[PDB]
Amino acid sequence: AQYEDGKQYTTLEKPVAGAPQVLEFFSFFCPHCYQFEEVLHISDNVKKKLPEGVKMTKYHVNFMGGDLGKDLTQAWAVAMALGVEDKVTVPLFEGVQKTQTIRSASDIRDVFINAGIKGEEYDAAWNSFVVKSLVAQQEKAAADVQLRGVPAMFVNGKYQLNPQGMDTSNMDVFVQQYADTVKYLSEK
Tell me if 11 sits within 8 A of 159, measured CB to CB: yes
DSSP 8: T
Resolution for the entry shown, Å: 2.1
Question: Using N-to-C axis directions, what is the helix angle for 129-144 and 119-127, rounded to 10°?
Answer: 60
8 Å CB contact between 57 and 76: no
Position 124, amino acid: A
2: which residues sit within 8 A by CB, 6+ positions away?
none
83 in the Ramachandran plot: left (φ > 0), alpha (ψ -120 to 50) or beta?
A: left
Strand order of the β-sheet with 9-11 is 9-11, 159-161, 152-155, 22-26, 56-60
Experimental technique used?
Answer: X-ray
Integer Cα distance of 60 and 22 in angstroms = 14
Angle at alpha carbon of residue 79, lines to 78 and 84, rounded to 5°: 145
Nearest of 105, 87, 84 to residue 96 by alpha carbon: 105
Q: Give the integer Cα–Cα distance in Å for 127 and 125.
A: 5
What are 57's strand-pairing partners? 23
Q: What's 33-53 look like in SS3?
A: HHHHHHHCCHHHHHHHHCCCC
Beta strand 152-155 with 9-11: parallel, antiparallel or unpaired? unpaired
Residue-range domains of the chain with CATH: 1-188 (3.40.30.10)
